[PDB]
């Protein structure tokens, strides 16, 4: 049931000081802690993607590199998860994160992914309810190796930031939800990303996809949709973090961005 259905445009913007996360699982209070890790560099080139459905294959695949900073000001009901892997077919392992209104469900299987994968909602007359279908995400799922269901992390103006790292087998997800007063979507200041979910995956990931929810029309088989999301890339790089008296990373300096920063 794979159709090439979603188009996408891209622009370029500035990361400012976003993408900071807690590097470990240790409380620190009123200290200046220097750590070298996969961080999003300050004031970097971050791609703004507008994914459009109106009622050909125009949704190209992004490389994963060393890790992905993801951001979205759009609400949690249309954007509903991510896809990770290398070839996205039955020959290799594939990882799928799907959020819905009750929980979040994660697979590592061999998915035979479609070229333009999307979760589509439709009403079932036997169940008499609006149910979700993954038949446009993939055609099959066999030899499945991992499954994990937890409380969701896409809930409800609200900027949602995520950091995905793939280090020595573990897929680490960091997240933050920040109420952003009407203005520039990527705001100034610091919002440190708390370590959310560390998944025991152990697969090769060099390419990724982001998963959209599409609604049937019941009035051009799908309702028209729009999504805006920012993608940046992490680098192995040294930060200096300021921990306040409550243990929150409130400020940081990236060492290579400026000579003065390096002096700091």
């Amino acid at each position, epitope marked *: 049931q794979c159709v090439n259905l979603i188009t996408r445009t891209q622009s370029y913007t500035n990361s400012f000081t976003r993408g900071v996360y807690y590097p470990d699982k240790v409380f620190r209070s009123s200290v200046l802690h220097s750590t070298q890790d996969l961080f999003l560099p300050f004031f970097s080139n971050v791609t703004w993607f507008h994914a459009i459905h109106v009622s050909r294959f125009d949704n190209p695949v992004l490389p994963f590199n060393d890790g992905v900073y993801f951001a979205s000001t759009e609400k949690s009901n249309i954007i509903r998860g991510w896809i990770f892997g290398t070839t996205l077919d039955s020959k290799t392992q594939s990882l799928l994160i799907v959020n819905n209104a009750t929980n979040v469900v994660i697979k590592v299987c061999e998915f035979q992914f479609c070229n333009d994968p999307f979760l589509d909602v439709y*009403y079932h*007359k*036997n169940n008499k309810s*609006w149910m979700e279908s993954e038949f446009r995400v993939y055609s099959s799922a066999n030899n499945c190796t991992f499954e994990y269901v937890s409380q969701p992390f896409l809930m409800d103006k609200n900027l949602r930031e995520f950091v995905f790292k793939n280090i020595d087998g573990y897929f680490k997800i960091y997240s933050k939800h920040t109420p952003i007063n009407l203005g520039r979507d990527l705001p100034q200041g610091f919002s440190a990303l708390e370590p959310l979910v560390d998944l025991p995956i152990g697969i090769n990931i060099t390419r990724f996809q982001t998963l959209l929810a599409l*609604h049937r029309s*019941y*009035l051009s088989g799908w309702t028209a949709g729009a999504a805006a999301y920012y993608v940046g890339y992490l680098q192995p790089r040294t930060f200096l973090l300021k921990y306040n008296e409550n243990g929150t990373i409130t400020d940081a300096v990236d060492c290579a961005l400026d000579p003065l920063s390096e002096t700091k």
Partner: antibody
Amino acid sequence: EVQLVESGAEVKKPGASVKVSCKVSGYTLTELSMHWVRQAPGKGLEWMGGFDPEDGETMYAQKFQGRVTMTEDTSTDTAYMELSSLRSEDTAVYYCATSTAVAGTPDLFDYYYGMDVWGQGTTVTVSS
Amino acid sequence: EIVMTQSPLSSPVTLGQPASISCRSSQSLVHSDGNTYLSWLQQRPGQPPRLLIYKISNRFSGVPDRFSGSGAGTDFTLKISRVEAEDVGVYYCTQATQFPYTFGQGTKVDIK
């Protein structure tokens, strides 16, 4: 847009079941209320039966109960109809109709009734 | 069972003139959802009927603006502003509120 296709016309000796099919394309059948209508030559067209979104599943005519039975194959996305105890007046053109089960967005949706898209009729002939 | 009446049975209409068809129901077609459910269909010889109008006044896709619907309660009218050579055939009014679904006897419209 829902597209409806039909099976071939038939002639049968009275006293046997008739298998009449309607295949749905463009949409899957679980989003669609499915209905069936007869038309005699020289008479007004009246109803076999069809789906009910609420307070039951499938409803039939009062004079045609006990003879019409209705199956839906979700794998092949088909609707089959069986009708037994044929009569010499049953020489008629059979229409398969369909309509959307609901209308609106997932947050605000309302149940729909009606016969919007109609397919081509199949000629049911009862003779010697 | 809801019984309806169609009027007139045969209406000889000249080219271009509007024609009005009355559908009358013995029972009120108001539903618990609020919206009243009436559908008008047009059937050509050699052609299955297609949906001309659904819910009194709302237009189906591909239906031209030459057709109008009006009325409420138990009295409904379908008006054809321009009658052409493709308008010949039998018109039906049907209800979808109360089971069983019953259909009108049809109104035959021709040219001459």
